[PDB]
Design a protein around this ligand. Structure first.
Ligand SMILES: NC(=O)c1ccc[n+]([C@@H]2O[C@H](COP(=O)([O-])OP(=O)(O)OC[C@H]3O[C@@H](n4cnc5c(N)ncnc54)[C@H](O)[C@@H]3O)[C@@H](O)[C@H]2O)c1
Ligand SMILES: NC(=O)c1ccc[n+]([C@@H]2O[C@H](COP(=O)([O-])OP(=O)(O)OC[C@H]3O[C@@H](n4cnc5c(N)ncnc54)[C@H](O)[C@@H]3O)[C@@H](O)[C@H]2O)c1
Ligand SMILES: NC(=O)c1ccc[n+]([C@@H]2O[C@H](COP(=O)([O-])OP(=O)(O)OC[C@H]3O[C@@H](n4cnc5c(N)ncnc54)[C@H](O)[C@@H]3O)[C@@H](O)[C@H]2O)c1
Ligand SMILES: NC(=O)c1ccc[n+]([C@@H]2O[C@H](COP(=O)([O-])OP(=O)(O)OC[C@H]3O[C@@H](n4cnc5c(N)ncnc54)[C@H](O)[C@@H]3O)[C@@H](O)[C@H]2O)c1
Ligand SMILES: Nc1cc(Cl)ccc1Oc1ccc(Cl)cc1O
Ligand SMILES: Nc1cc(Cl)ccc1Oc1ccc(Cl)cc1O
Ligand SMILES: Nc1cc(Cl)ccc1Oc1ccc(Cl)cc1O
Ligand SMILES: Nc1cc(Cl)ccc1Oc1ccc(Cl)cc1O
Lengths: 289, 286, 286, 289
């Protein structure tokens, strides 16, 4: 029935955004990528040069179909928020309509209303620092980019979404339990995001009949995950998860993708405001073996 | 060839039926576990076509029911049945309805299965507040509503394939106070949600089998009507205050169940998943 | 004239004793409820001065023990005792040890009390994993460890003053998986924490009485030693990974209990309070 | 044994800061007030003129003793963070050493090391707006003033605190469950604060043997609470609490104070990283009557 999904936060094929795209594509949902301007050019070149073709293979019966690929920066709500420096920066200078409001408008003009929205991004300048050593600026950066970006995303996309639409984001259990090394206010940011998902579920539910949930994912060696280490963090997390989770299988990006796909579909019609753990059951453990 | 056993169907008005309907959409073969005191009433209504409209999925298909068997979650094995039950008019003409007996019967008739649904509860003192519940009444609630899941798992894992999946149904009274949800049902649900985690660990590590529980919102089922207009209140409150105003349907729980029982959810286990139009997230009635 | 009944003291090595010591600091009169199979051993050790050093509070004072009574949380009333127990060598020389009988005895001897501590648990199959626990074993855990709180409340409220306060002890295995905490103890604790909320509502509205539960970290008590080196592991893990490295003492739980039982906490009820050096907040062992 | 407590966030006698001061004073703890510069002058005048004397009465046996009263703005980590405008603002111009670091230094110089710390402040420019209508600036303001201020407070005060010291803040259940009207990112901010309390408990515990907890308080008609209403919010909350809480008594500021006092004392030695509800049990309810 022409399901269309905007995925905010893909920069290569190694993260959760790609797994989500892949699983949605299997269900025939049309995909639009929102790509952060620092990685946008290299994403487009790699794509054009066929570097992603193997990764786009669904089952060798089918391959992913990408409707569109758009520059997107979740730091900026509207054109008026973009500082002169950023506007003129080498990587931004050749790009247009990349703020949250502008991408919503652009999508609406080209394709009309959509019914699925994925927030799959996060950022924090001081992620390598422990919370106690994080500055005011660095903490506010984490909240701005990782948490506020969801609210803003919702604010502007609800106008271009049909009733009974669905929105998902991605979170991590460090919001609820202590993960040393998940620094820079990222733990704080995921805690805010999980709480905001409830408040948004209430308002979007009553005022638009739109659902919103978040997926608390287990560890995946994405490009962003690698950046967490100082002086690795993700290696430890993965090793620990595969050794101690109730389910010992390797956690795949498409494992999250298939849950995202369910949550974005009408099958999850009575679920909203929730944090859903897709982490091989690791979250349930207290004492290891 | 997916097969699901659904323990706890008494008519077409509860969550078991909605779960059956939705699994039927995905062409899963369904086997009903029916409490013996209502087994013959159910079979008669079924034979008489009372459930026919309720069995329609759409233009294409109609529910495919593989089998319907008497099943009593009060009893683990044949040895556990008391004489009063043996001498009951409703039980005396039935056989092989203990938890172990039904596992053996299903396995003998159809081989290994890969989906298991616990959709049952009982508490002989549900109408009393917790403080006025007796020891026998409280332990009955836990026996029928909580331990029954553990025993179901114990006997059914042997007849299940690797990567199988199990769900039960719970209610948010385990976590926040619902006056009226009495007789130790709130306790039973708290135990069920906790047991779901412990079972998830053991079943996952030993068998690669998953187990989850769905925390459902209110539905005007037969069991619900037995709690003391309680259900009319809960439904009215939910439809007034839940983030989503839609009427909650048994098939809304059914489609979540179907997802949790399928391989699409291979990385989810030990979880309480809320399917209640968001009501659980609210604090202050607006 | 504050009086506290402490149900579940068997020696000086568990949390009941630590709670007794701390309440004694505040000059609360303490009455011990002692499980009959260990009642005479306890009385003999006490008479023989084995507990004397353990009774010292400081330079000033020593624990003031008002009374010590046999108490069995298995039985609500005299009628509930089975003949095998009646004919037991340890029970036959004792009397008035059912929950109701002890409430009546305390009230007759000393009048109304204002503090109640449930510091007991039992599970006959604690050494089995949940999946291998039988119905009788699982219901025993719930009967002795969970329902006992409800019944304690039921019978003791009549002998308590308005604004009285009640606590029990739980463990984080109710909420997160602890392999080894078997026999349905994890289930019993989940039910206990849930029941604490439901009881809080009813006791608060009807009697202005508060009830809370303390989720304690590991202590090398007699009961703990019976779980299967499990306790040595938990202690070692806790002292290695808890935010606070201090050794957890029974009196660390005792001073929290004393606060929860006093009027300083008049606005706290229905809560699970973690007294475990912060261990529960951790996800990833650093 | 000369217990000394710094209370960050008092501006009159109607809030939780005053109840906390009163209960601590009963235990003979010496109190130092950190007073936000916009209300500081009026606080000092009222005090000098004896306007608080009745409110300082403990039991007519005893009256509160306040060791010191210091201008304090939790927006600023160090002197170097203060913008020229604020430095020169009418209400700030005559005040000195009011940043987090400067007050810590000042306290240390005058009285040596302390052992108790209370964060009893919050702020959010757009509190009257629902989350969806909150701007990026307004949301970041809520997190900065209500959440980051705790981390910073901890960072600078740990150097002037003894081992086995204790720190508390105040939070509200809107972090966990939806409270329509608790707007501007305050819900997000309390969610971050509750999560930060865990991460801080871990680091302060291991590296300083210092405890930190937060109290999730029920509704109290403080000056700040009144400011929440638009176009009242607190009236509704109070009425609802007294009608539906397990305990029907009126919730008092000193009810929180006596819990704060316990948590700050050695009696709570094995408790850290926790959210403790002091709300007459309201949080435990699902369905009202
Ligand atoms: N990787 C994990 O193990 C893991 C575990 C739990 C949660 N998550 C969450 O999943 C999400 C995806 O992260 P990932 O792990 O796939 O890494 P990723 O790099 O694949 O995803 C992050 C992407 O977001 C983009 N991005 C960053 N800032 C942006 C901005 N201001 N505007 C637009 N785009 C921006 C980046 O270009 C990047 O491609 C994150 O929110 C993360 O918190 C990841
Ligand atoms: N209906 C609701 O509002 C609601 C909300 C949350 C959870 N639930 C849960 O959903 C599940 C299904 O109940 P329902 O609401 O559909 O009502 P229901 O009456 O349709 O289902 C309960 C069934 O359990 C069966 N049963 C009772 N005792 C049994 C025993 N000893 N052995 C085998 N079967 C037995 C009954 O015959 C009945 O058919 C229950 O576990 C309930 O706790 C229901
Ligand atoms: N020790 C720990 O590590 C730990 C951690 C968390 C919680 N707890 C809880 O603290 C409480 C006290 O146990 P403990 O650890 O001090 O061990 P303990 O052995 O000192 O206390 C348990 C007591 O309960 C008594 N008891 C057993 N069955 C009884 C019955 N039917 N009626 C009356 N009394 C009975 C026993 O005689 C024993 O003295 C328990 O409820 C336990 O679950 C203990
Ligand atoms: N009042 C309630 O019902 C309630 C319920 C739950 C939690 N709380 C929490 O209790 C705390 C105290 O608030 P309250 O309700 O007592 O109102 P209050 O006005 O008594 O306390 C807030 C005080 O903090 C001060 N302050 C604000 N910004 C500051 C800054 N940047 N630097 C220094 N000081 C600043 C203000 O001058 C004010 O006096 C708040 O954190 C609030 O979130 C209050
Ligand atoms: N995308 C992103 C950005 C930053 Cl700065 C930090 C973590 C990020 O994602 C994550 C990666 C690994 C894990 Cl275990 C959790 C995450 O949330
Ligand atoms: N099936 C069953 C049996 C008993 Cl004794 C009590 C409730 C039962 O189901 C429910 C019905 C309505 C609601 Cl809101 C929750 C339930 O759990
Ligand atoms: N008192 C009791 C009885 C049984 Cl059967 C099992 C554990 C018991 O107490 C405990 C001891 C150690 C830990 Cl870590 C948790 C407990 O709950
Ligand atoms: N101190 C403060 C500042 C702002 Cl902007 C909003 C709320 C504030 O405190 C509160 C008041 C009432 C309630 Cl029920 C919760 C609060 O947290």
């Amino acid at each position: 029935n022409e399901d269309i999904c905007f995925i905010a936060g893909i920069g290569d094929t190694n993260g959760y955004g790609w797994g989500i795209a892949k699983e949605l594509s299997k269900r025939n949902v049309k995909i639009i990528f929102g790509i952060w301007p620092p990685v946008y050019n290299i994403f487009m070149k790699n794509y054009k040069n066929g570097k992603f073709d193997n990764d786009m293979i669904i089952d060798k019966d089918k391959k992913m179909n990408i409707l569109d690929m758009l520059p997107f920066d979740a730091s900026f709500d509207t054109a008026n928020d973009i500082d002169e420096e950023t506007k003129n920066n080498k990587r931004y200078n050749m790009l247009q309509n990349y703020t949250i409001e502008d991408v919503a408008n652009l999508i609406h003009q080209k394709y009309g209303k959509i019914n699925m929205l994925v927030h799959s991004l996060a950022n924090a300048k001081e992620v390598q620092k422990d919370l106690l050593n994080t500055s005011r600026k660095g903490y506010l950066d984490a909240l701005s980019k990782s948490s506020y970006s969801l609210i803003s995303l919702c604010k502007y996309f609800v106008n271009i979404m049909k009733p009974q639409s669905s929105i998902i984001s991605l979170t991590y259990h460090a919001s609820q339990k202590v993960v040393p090394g998940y620094g820079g206010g990222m733990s704080s940011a995921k805690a805010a995001l999980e709480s905001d998902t409830r408040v948004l579920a209430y308002h979007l539910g009553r005022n638009y009949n739109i659902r919103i949930n978040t997926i608390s994912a287990g560890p995946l060696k994405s490009r962003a995950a690698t950046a967490i280490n100082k002086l690795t963090f993700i290696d430890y997390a993965i090793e620990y998860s595969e050794k101690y989770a109730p389910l010992r299988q390797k956690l795949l990006s498409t494992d999250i993708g298939s849950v995202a796909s369910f949550l974005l579909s009408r099958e999850s019609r009575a679920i909203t405001g929730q944090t859903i753990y897709v982490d091989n059951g690791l979250n349930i453990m207290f004492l290891p073996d």
